């Protein structure tokens, strides 16, 4: 299986709809070698894919959003299992594949009740302390603390790629057209200016958020490269005795 | 014309008096008192030394270089001190000015205070009073929000990290309370909730407030994430202090000893 | 030809599908500016991305998309094109759209509207056809009561007659229509049926054809009256009504027989006043006396095989004729080339009805540009998508070879390396039909895959030397893999240590049955013992490449492996059919001997959609009860439709379809007790 082969598949996956929704799967299966992912606990919190998976012959985890099932949006079990997947991942020294499409929080009473805050911590802890080289790619969509929380650049990311279907918010556009103009009532102008200014990957480009927008059909060959060259990764940590986890 | 002494001396007013008396009044008889004499209240007499204390945010877009929504301070107070004689990095959000939003100055500075502290070797103890963000900055500011978590992520283990919560925080913010050790509440003063009643009613279709969905009750008797809850605020501060002086200051250091008769 | 002769300067494709790239890429060859139109579904399609612009007619639904005219005269206004190409279909024989465009100061390239209301009726294109000398079906439509009348026209006309009823007669004079004592029985008989169904007791003459073959004579013509027949083609395998495998040449007719139909087919074209290009097909019989039926006016897709027994190309020489200059080759200059043969790959399952529509999504793709002598059209790429509102031809290949056995060798060659994943497709059934005895020696008729094939398509029986050797290559793919997985890199802390095992013995189940293979690796060669037969099997043995060639004991084979689980069973692809092999060793097989097996609750009770599509109407209710026989609802998909029954007498508990609803891929429609 060659390293550098291209993958013209990845051009249309994802709709140009900011609604509909694409089996997620298929973009893992093009990009690994041989086509081969062995899924873990497949049948339990379909939100979150973890797996195993071989790119140039080096064993690798993935783990990526599924915007099939609830739309994506990540709770208590997709916390908890894409912690200890990433934990034991670390623990082992296994390089992380990140596939990141997520619109925030799932809210409800039942979420809130169930303590939604201590599994996201579990999470968002199990991939801030994660040191291992992990490269992650933003597909579609990042809204609110979620993209924080999955593997963003700030939190010792290695190297991030975005398509150009990406893009990347705070808060509905529906409700902040109608939240920043409190003095009075605007519509269509500033809904069109809304959509043509923050619906782009550009502000987090120029931001520095992303190293830059890459092809989809080249995405496999940047990947690979990266595990080529970011394999001598060790820090540098203050002395503890051992970590506390929100377990 | 003017010297710089006058304008110094009219934003220290400004920041001392806040968005105005009548917000200070209105704070007052509201039932909680401002994050200046909570951090005097706190610590002991005479011996707290703040630092940045001249930090403001700048925005180019949205038109905000008037003064009328400018405010030195950015709604963070944050400093160093001795409590019982043993040193302490002191965290305080402010609610005066844009109810405690944080932004780029607000991150910075929260992120000095933590690397010093991880530094030296003392604990962080910190007061959180917000109710939203700027939306006019965007994105930008949730980036803040990243390298916070991330500090907390490498003092985990290394020094002790406290966080009493007393004001309405909610959204992408109630992370960082949620990665330090122990947490504490004030009864119906400090409210917890990643997305607020509004969304959840709109979307989930039921009558909800505020109340039970993030009061001090819900979540320290069947939600399980906060450790204990207090009726009014002094009384906070009051029982922070000995809590505290059961602690030690990093893990390098053994449990303190005290005379006992 | 020569370039700097004037001609359009842009150019209208109104078109969907292969046919929309074939036209653009012409276009582009000759140096005229193209604009394709596109609809919802279709905005990232190739056509879309090879020509310049890119007007979207409106939504999904064909019946309101690339069938409106208002949207395609808006098109036409923007884009200021000063002519258009209709292909085929859709409405490219459409009088409505034809007086329109016409009204307007632009030209439509095809033939004129009025050939097209010659055509279209049936009456007056008999009438035309007689007046054309053109040799046409025989027969009396008139009121016979008499049977000795009924015999007499019989006997002037020849003992085997296609006699009917215009309501019906079940039958009438067509049957048992060779000697004529029993059409003077069928008489009676059937004017008592009609008495007791239908009514008309009279008989209706027509000829009959024995085992039809209808072959199609392509006609084109200028706007000066010059008119050429460029060669037959033969198209005598079709299923549905639907022509599936074509080859340029008739064998079954010589010289003189395709000259005098040659002249006919002008002399109708030009009896119509006809330009550009057209077909006329006649249904020959078995002693060489042809009959004339039907004449298509348009660009057929089956049209480039001809090409590749002339050297023209058809696309380039209409859109320069409707400019008006007159065509400059000549009767006498048309010849042979050697022989051709094309096929067209849909989407579809052959193993149900002969090929019942599917959907989903290309996940690769690639086809054998570098074989000799195949030639590809193709209207889709790697990740494209299959819908429910379009054809579902995927595409079409044409082998060109000196002779008929060559083109025939290269086509299986081709059809072995056109790899497809992610929908169904019916390689399997032109390969299997393609070497069929009586299809190579010649003697095919209309039916030719109706009776061959009483029970449907059951795959490509397999002898026991290719079933030997089918069993050596799995062994040898199953030894290769395990192989494989035993290269690590060097530790430096703990030793890898290679297990050494001389000979592996294996148990191959196949089908029904298990078998016992001993294989052994000599490197890179294959030495594998199948019930005490040798066979010996070489390869560069690419585990990731998508297609494998493998040489068995000297004969070269091409290969492709799918579905290869971890608990041994795999989906083979091997001489275009798809074989299920479960690989265990000695062991793992006695041991499996003991595991009790997971008894499966599915027997019929269920009616879930044989493949996906829309249903329409559904002629049963939830708790009734239906007998054997009676159909459960209608579905379209893609422009077809399909009836399907219940195998068991029962009530339904459930109908979980009704009408304007969305069917999924094996969806639960019925459950009945
Ligand atoms: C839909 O895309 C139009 C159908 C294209 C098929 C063309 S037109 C009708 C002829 N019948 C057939 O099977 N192919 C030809």
Known sequence: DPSDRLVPELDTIVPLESTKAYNMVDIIHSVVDEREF?????????????????????????????????????????????????????????????????????????????????????????????????????????????????????????????????????????????????????????????????????????????????????????????????????????????????? | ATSVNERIENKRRTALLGGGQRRIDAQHKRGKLTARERISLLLDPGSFVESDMFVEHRCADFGMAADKNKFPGDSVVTGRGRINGRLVYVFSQDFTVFGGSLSGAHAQKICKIMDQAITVGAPVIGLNDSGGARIQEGVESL????????????????????????????????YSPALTDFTFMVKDTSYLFITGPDVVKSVTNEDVTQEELGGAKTHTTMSGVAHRAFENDVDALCNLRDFFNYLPLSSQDPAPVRECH | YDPNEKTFDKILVANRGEIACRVIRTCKKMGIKTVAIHSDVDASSVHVKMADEAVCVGPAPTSKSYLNMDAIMEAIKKTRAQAVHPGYGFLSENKEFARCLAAEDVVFIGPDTHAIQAMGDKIESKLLAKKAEVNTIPGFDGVVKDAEEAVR?????????????????????????????????????????????????????????????????????????????????????????????????????????????????????????????????????????????????????????????????????????????????????????????????????????????????????????????????????????????????????????????????????????????????????????????????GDISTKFLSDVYPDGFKGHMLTKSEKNQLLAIASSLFVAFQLRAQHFQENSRMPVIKPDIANWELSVKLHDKVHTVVASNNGSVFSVEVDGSKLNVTSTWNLASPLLSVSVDGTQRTVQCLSREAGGNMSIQFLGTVYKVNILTRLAAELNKFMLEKVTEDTSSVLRSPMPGVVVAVSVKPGDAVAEGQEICVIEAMKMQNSMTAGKTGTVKSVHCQAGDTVGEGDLLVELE
Not at chain 1, 97 to 114: C, K, M, N, R, S
Not at chain 1, 199 to 222: C, E, K, L, M, Y
Not at chain 3, 272 to 300: C, H, I, P, W
């Open chain 3, 153 to 441: 026209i019989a006997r002037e006309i020849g003992y085997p007659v296609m006699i009917k009823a215009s309501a019906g007669g079940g039958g009438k004079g067509m049957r048992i229509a060779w000697d004529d004592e029993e059409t003077r029985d069928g008489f009676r008989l059937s004017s008592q049926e009609a008495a007791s169904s239908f009514g008309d007791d009279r008989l209706l003459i027509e000829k009959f054809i024995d085992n039809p073959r209808h072959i199609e004579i392509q006609v084109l013509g200028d706007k000066h009256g010059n008119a050429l027949w460029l060669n037959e083609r033969e198209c005598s395998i079709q299923r549905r009504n639907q022509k599936v495998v074509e080859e340029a040449p008739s064998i079954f007719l010589d010289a003189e027989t395709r000259r005098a139909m040659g002249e006919q087919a002008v002399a109708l074209a030009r009896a119509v006043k006809y330009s550009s290009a057209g077909t006329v097909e006649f249904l020959v019989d078995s002693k060489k006396n042809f009959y004339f039926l039907e004449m298509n006016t348009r660009l057929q897709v089956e049209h480039p095989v001809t090409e590749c027994i002339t050297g023209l190309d058809l696309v380039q020489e209409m859109i320069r004729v409707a400019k008006g200059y007159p065509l400059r080759h000549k009767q006498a200059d048309i010849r042979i080339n050697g022989w051709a043969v094309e096929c067209r790959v849909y989407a579809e399952d052959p193993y149900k009805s002969f090929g019942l529509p599917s959907i989903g999504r290309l996940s690769q793709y690639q086809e054998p540009l570098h074989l000799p002598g195949v030639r590809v059209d193709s209207g889709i790429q790697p990740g494209s998508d299959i819908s429910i509102y379009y054809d579902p031809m995927i595409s079409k290949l044409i082998t060109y070879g000196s002779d008929r056995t060559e083109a025939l060798k290269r086509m299986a060659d081709a059809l072995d390396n056109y790899v497809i994943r992610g929908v169904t497709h019916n390689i399997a059934l032109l390969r299997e039909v393609i070497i069929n005895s009586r299809f190579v020696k």
């Open chain 2, 143 to 174: 980036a803040g929000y990243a390298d916070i978590f991330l500090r907390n992520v490498t003092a985990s283990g290394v020094i002790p990290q406290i966080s009493l919560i007393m004001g309405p925080c909610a959204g992408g913010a109630v």
């Open chain 1, 38 to 247: 062995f899924e873990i606990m497949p049948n339990y919190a379909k939100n979150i894919i973890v797996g195993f998976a071989r790119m140039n012959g080096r064993t690798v985890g993935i783990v990526g959003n599924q915007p099939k099932v609830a739309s994506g949006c990540l709770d208590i079990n997709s916390s908890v299992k894409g912690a200890r997947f990433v934990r034991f991942c670390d623990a082992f020294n296994i390089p992380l594949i990140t596939f990141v499409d997520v619109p925030g929080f799932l809210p409800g009473t039942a979420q809130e009740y169930g303590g939604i805050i201590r599994h996201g911590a579990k999470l968002l802890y199990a991939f801030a302390e994660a040191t291992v080289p992990k490269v992650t790619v933003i597909t579609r969509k990042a809204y609110g603390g979620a993209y924080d929380v999955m593997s963003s650049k700030h939190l010792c990311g290695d190297t991030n790629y975005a398509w150009p279907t990406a893009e990347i918010a705070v808060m509905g556009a529906k409700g902040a057209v109608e939240i920043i103009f409190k003095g009075h009532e605007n519509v269509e102008a500033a809904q069109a200016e809304y959509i043509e200014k923050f619906a782009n990957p550009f502000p987090a480009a120029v931001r520095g958020f992303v190293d830059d927008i890459i092809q989809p059909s080249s995405t496999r060959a940047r990947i690979c490269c990266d595990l080529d060259v970011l394999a001598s990764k060790k820090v540098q940590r203050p002395w503890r005795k051992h970590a506390n986890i929100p377990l």
